[PDB]
Every structure is written in structure tokens, then in C-alpha cells.
């Protein structure tokens, strides 16, 4: 499924993002943005064999099980296929455990290079919230 923007925000604040670990929507929104371009069947293969999974590209070295991806965990304890889902709870249930890890939102290389600092608010602009 590609979400339209505010239809994601909408999404993510019903799964309880909004502010968590103290971010606001638009964090997540933008991180959503440059991950995914909003398309929850998203994959992209990373040089090190590992995949990434999903709206916000959850990893498959930690995060989830793929089968394929030689001495990873899954911290999430999920599928990595859960991750591909019209329905976003497995991929936020799972983002609240990655910013939780220590890193808050750079674990998201994309957010610290595309969104850290910028006008996160931009993206729940008109949004009905
Ligand atoms: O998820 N990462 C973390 C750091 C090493 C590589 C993978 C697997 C792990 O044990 C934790």
C-alpha cells in the first residue's frame, strides 16, 4: 500500500507514535518519506546481505527474520514479511523498540542525513490529527 501523507500520520498516531521517545509525527512522517516513499512493500538489499523491510526499513540483521541473513537477530521477533503489511502495526511496534535501542532516531541513517533538524512539522501540515 502507498500511503498518502496526512493518511500515514493518521496511522502513526492511532499506533501511539506521535511523541514517542519524544518525536514528534513529523519525524516519523519524513523518516517515512525517505525510507519508503510511503510504500509498506518497500525492500531494498544492503551490501552485507542484510534487507531492509517496510515503511520505515527495518533491518533484518537485528530486527527481523528473513531466513537469509547469516548471523542477525530478531529483536522484534517478527517476520520480516509482517514488515510489508497494508496494516503498519508490526513496523511501528517494532520502530518503538529500534528508537527505544539508544540512538532515538538515528538509527534511521536517512532521518540524521534527510530529517534531523529540518522543518518536521511541514509534513503534518493540513493534516486532519
Ligand atoms: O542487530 N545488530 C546488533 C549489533 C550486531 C549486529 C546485529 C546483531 C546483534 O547482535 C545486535
Redesign the pocket.
Given at each position: 500500500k502507498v500511503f498518502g501523507r496526512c493518511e500515514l500520520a493518521a496511522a502513526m498516531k492511532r499506533h501511539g507514535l506521535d511523541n514517542y521517545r519524544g518525536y514528534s509525527l513529523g519525524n516519523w512522517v519524513c523518516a517515512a518519506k525517505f525510507e519508503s516513499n510511503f510504500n509498506t512493500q518497500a525492500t531494498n538489499r544492503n551490501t552485507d546481505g542484510s534487507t531492509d523491510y517496510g515503511i520505515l526499513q527495518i533491518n533484518s540483521?537485528?530486527?527481523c527474520n528473513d531466513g537469509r541473513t547469516p548471523?542477525?537477530?530478531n529483536?522484534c521477533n517478527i517476520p520480516c514479511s509482517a514488515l510489508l503489511s497494508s496494516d503498519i502495526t508490526a513496523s511501528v511496534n517494532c520502530a518503538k523498540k529500534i528508537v527505544s535501542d539508544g540512538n532515538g532516531m538515528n538509527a534511521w541513517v536517512a532521518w540524521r542525513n534527510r530529517c534531523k533538524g529540518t522543518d518536521v512539522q511541514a509534513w503534518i501540515r493540513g493534516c486532519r490529527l
Open positions: 540483521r537485528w530486527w548471523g542477525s537477530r529483536l
